[PDB]
Design a protein around this ligand. Structure first.
Ligand SMILES: Nc1ncnc2c1ncn2[C@@H]1O[C@H](COP(=O)(O)OP(=O)(O)O)[C@@H](O)[C@H]1O
Ligand SMILES: Nc1ncnc2c1ncn2[C@@H]1O[C@H](COP(=O)(O)OP(=O)(O)O)[C@@H](O)[C@H]1O
Lengths: 122, 122, 61, 120, 99, 122
C-alpha cells in the first residue's frame, strides 16, 4: 500500500508485489503447514471456542476457549451437539425455524461416550 | 416422550423408504422402510450398512465421500464405478481379481422416498 | 446431475452446502478438539490454495 | 496365503493381524535382552475397544494373554461381557461435583463345577 | 454375537426396579443383600450401576469392609463377587435425578 | 483355562496397586487394587479413568502424552502442572480459579506397586 503511492514508474510497487507473491508461493508450496493454512484458508484465520452458559444467568459458566482439556466423552458430546446445531441451521430454509429436509444420517456417531450421555445427544 | 414424536413429518420431509437394485453388494431389488420416529440400521460388521449410507449420499450430494465413516482423513477407497460394478475388494479368500459382481452390461437404480403430511417426493 | 441437484436445492430451499454437510456428517467418527470439528466438519473448504498458483504464474509473466 | 487372504468382515482379519503384530512388538520391546519374557509385563490401554467388535476384541484379549502381558482395560461401562469374562477385578471410578473417586470390586470363579445334577 | 449384543442390561428398567425395591424395604441395603433380593442377569454390569447409584447420591461406599455375593450365571458356573460395603437408601436415591 | 492364568507373577513383574494423593480430581487419598488376572476400569464419562491412567503413565514414561486416547495421537491435551493442581475444565473466562482445586501450596503423591514372586517394587 505504501509503495503504490511512489512515483518511480511502478518500481517500488513491483518490488512490494514481488515480496507478496513470494510469500504466497512459499505458502502454496508447503500447502499443509499451519502458517500456510492460516494464510490461504478462510476457516484457519480464526480460532473456535465453545461456552456453556446459564439460561437465565448470562454469565459464561464454563468457557472452553479451545482449551482441549476434556475427556473423550465430553469432546464427543460437544462435537455431536455442535454438528446437530449446524445441520439444523443448514437444512432450515432462510427465515424458517423448521427444516424442510428433516432426515439426517449418523454413522457410528457415538463410541467414546457412556450410554447415559448418548441419550442426551439423541 | 411420544407427544414430541408426532412433530416429525409435519413441518418437514422425512425419509420413509429406500430402494436399491444391483447397488454395491445388494444384488437384485431390495427395499427398506424407515420409521417416522427415528430408525437404526444394525447388523454384523461389513454386511451392507455403509453401502446404504453411500447410496443415499449419492442420491443427495454432487461428489459424495464414500466410506467417510472409516476412511475419514484420507481419500475414500470406494467410488461410484465400484458400487455399480459391485466389486468386493475387502471381501476375499478366493478373489478372482476383486470379484466384480456385475462385469458385463448392467443397470443399477437407487430411489429414496421422503414424506411430509401425505406429500411424497421420490 | 447438475440440473438434478439444482432441482433438489430449489425444492428443499437449501444450498449445496447443506447437503455437503449432510454427507460429511457420516464421517464424524474421526473427531478431535472443537477446532478440528469446525474446520473439517462444518463450513466447507472454500480455500484459495489454487487461485494462489494462478496469481503466481501471472506474476511470473 | 503369502498375502493376507481376507478379513473377518470389514477389516476383521486385518484388525486381528495388526493387533497381534503390535502386541508382539510390545512384548519384544519389553522383553529384556536375551529374555523370553518381558520384565515389565503390565500394559495400560485407555478406551480398550471402542472401534472393535466383540469377536475381534476377544481375539486381541487372547493375544495379549498369550504373550504374557497382564493388561488393564479402561472402558466407559461398555463391552462389559468380554471384560468380565476375561478379567477378575474392576475399579469403578465415579466423579461428583469437582472431585472424582474410585471403588474397587473383584470376583472369582468358585471351583465347584460348570453345573451339578445335570450333564457333565 | 449380533444376538448377544442385541440383549443387554437396560439400565432404566434396572433403576426402576432398584428404586422400587429400596422404597419397599426402606432400609439401608448392602450390595450383596441387593443381589440376593434382585438377581442380576449380567453380574458386574448390574453392580456398577448400583455403585453408580451409591456414589451419585452421596452414599459413601467403604472398601475396607468387603462383603461377598455368590451368583450363578446362565451356563451354571458360579462366581463369588467380592463387593464392597455400601449404604444404599431409598430417600436419597429417589431424590437424585436420573437421566 | 485357569491354569494358564497362573503364569502372572511366576514369570515377571505385574502391577498390583496404584496410590493417588491430590492427583487431578482425586482429592484426598485414593487406592486402587489391580488383580493379577487382569482388571477393568469402568465408569461414566467425566470420571477419573483417564486421570488414573495418566498418573501411572507419568510414573513410567519420561515424556508422557496425556489424554492420548481422546487426542488420538495429536498434541498432548494436558501436562503435569494441570494434573497436580487438579484443574477441572478450562475454568470459565473471568479468572475465578474455581476450575483449579489446588491453587495454593499443595502436594500430590502418586505411587504404583509391582509384584513378582512376592518381591515388591514401589
Ligand atoms: N463398492 C465396493 N467396494 C468394495 N467392497 C464392497 C463394495 N460394495 C460392497 N462391498 C463389500 O460389501 C461389504 C460392505 O461392508 P459395509 O457394511 O458397507 O461397511 P461397514 O462396516 O462400515 O458397515 C464389505 O465386505 C465390502 O467389501
Ligand atoms: N487437565 C484437565 N483439564 C480439564 N479437565 C480435566 C483435566 N484433567 C482431568 N480433567 C477432568 O477429569 C476428567 C478426566 O476425563 P475422564 O473421565 O477420566 O475420561 P473418559 O471420558 O473416558 O471417561 C474429565 O471430566 C476432565 O474434565
Amino acid at each position: 500500500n505504501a509503495a503504490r503511492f511512489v512515483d518511480d514508474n511502478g518500481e517500488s510497487h513491483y518490488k512490494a508485489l514481488q515480496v507478496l507473491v513470494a510469500q504466497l508461493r512459499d505458502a502454496c508450496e508447503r500447502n499443509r503447514t499451519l502458517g500456510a493454512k492460516a494464510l490461504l484458508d478462510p476457516r484457519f484465520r480464526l480460532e473456535f471456542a465453545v461456552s456453556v452458559m446459564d439460561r437465565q444467568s448470562g454469565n459464561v459458566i464454563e468457557s472452553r476457549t479451545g482449551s482441549q482439556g476434556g475427556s473423550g466423552g465430553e469432546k464427543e458430546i460437544i462435537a455431536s451437539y455442535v454438528l446437530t446445531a449446524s445441520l439444523s441451521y443448514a437444512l432450515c430454509p432462510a427465515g424458517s425455524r423448521y427444516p424442510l429436509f428433516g432426515t439426517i444420517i449418523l454413522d457410528e456417531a457415538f463410541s467414546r461416550s457412556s450410554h447415559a450421555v448418548a441419550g442426551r445427544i439423541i | 416422550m411420544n407427544q414430541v414424536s408426532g412433530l416429525a413429518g409435519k413441518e418437514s420431509f422425512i425419509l420413509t423408504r429406500i430402494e436399491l437394485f444391483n447397488w454395491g453388494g445388494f444384488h437384485g431389488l431390495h427395499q427398506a422402510a424407515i420409521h417416522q420416529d427415528g430408525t437404526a440400521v444394525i447388523g454384523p460388521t461389513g454386511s451392507g450398512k455403509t453401502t446404504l449410507v453411500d447410496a443415499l449420499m449419492t442420491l443427495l450430494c454432487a461428489n459424495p465421500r464414500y466410506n467417510l465413516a472409516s476412511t475419514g482423513g484420507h481419500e475414500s477407497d470406494r467410488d461410484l464405478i465400484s458400487y455399480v460394478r459391485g466389486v468386493s475388494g475387502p471381501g476375499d479368500g478366493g478373489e478372482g481379481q476383486s470379484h466384480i459382481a456385475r462385469p458385463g452390461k448392467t443397470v443399477t437404480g437407487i430411489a429414496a422416498t421422503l414424506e411430509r403430511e401425505g406429500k411424497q417426493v421420490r | 446431475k447438475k440440473q438434478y441437484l439444482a432441482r433438489l436445492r430449489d425444492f428443499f430451499e437449501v444450498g449445496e452446502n447443506a447437503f455437503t454437510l449432510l454427507n460429511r456428517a457420516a464421517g464424524l467418527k474421526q473427531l478431535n478438539s472443537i477446532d478440528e470439528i469446525f474446520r473439517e466438519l462444518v463450513l466447507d473448504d472454500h480455500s484459495a490454495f489454487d487461485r494462489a498458483a494462478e496469481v503466481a504464474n501471472s506474476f511470473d509473466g | 496365503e503369502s498375502r493376507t487372504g481376507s478379513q473377518g468382515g470389514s477389516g476383521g482379519e486385518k484388525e486381528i493381524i495388526a493387533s497381534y503384530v503390535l502386541t508382539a512388538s510390545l512384548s519384544y520391546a519389553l522383553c529384556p535382552a536375551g529374555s523370553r519374557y518381558p520384565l515389565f509385563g503390565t500394559i495400560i490401554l485407555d478406551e480398550a475397544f471402542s472401534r472393535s467388535s466383540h469377536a475381534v476384541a476377544g481375539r486381541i484379549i487372547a493375544a495379549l494373554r498369550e504373550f504374557g502381558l497382564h493388561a488393564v482395560f479402561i472402558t466407559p461401562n461398555k463391552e462389559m461381557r468380554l471384560l468380565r469374562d476375561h478379567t477378575r477385578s474392576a475399579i469403578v471410578v465415579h466423579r461428583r461435583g469437582q472431585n472424582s473417586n474410585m471403588a474397587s470390586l473383584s470376583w472369582e470363579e468358585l471351583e465347584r463345577h460348570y453345573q451339578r445334577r445335570g450333564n457333565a | 454375537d449380533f444376538w448377544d449384543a442385541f440383549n443387554g442390561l437396560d439400565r432404566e428398567v434396572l433403576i426402576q426396579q432398584t428404586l422400587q425395591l429400596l422404597a419397599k424395604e426402606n432400609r439401608p441395603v448392602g450390595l450383596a443383600e441387593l443381589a440376593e433380593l434382585l438377581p442380576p442377569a449380567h453380574d458386574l454390569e448390574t453392580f456398577a450401576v448400583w455403585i453408580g447409584m451409591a456414589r451419585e447420591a452421596g452414599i459413601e461406599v467403604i472398601d475396607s469392609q468387603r462383603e461377598f455375593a455368590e451368583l450363578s450365571d446362565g451356563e451354571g458356573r458360579r462366581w463369588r463377587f467380592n463387593l464392597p460395603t455400601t449404604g444404599l437408601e431409598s430417600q436419597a436415591l429417589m431424590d437424585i435425578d436420573w437421566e
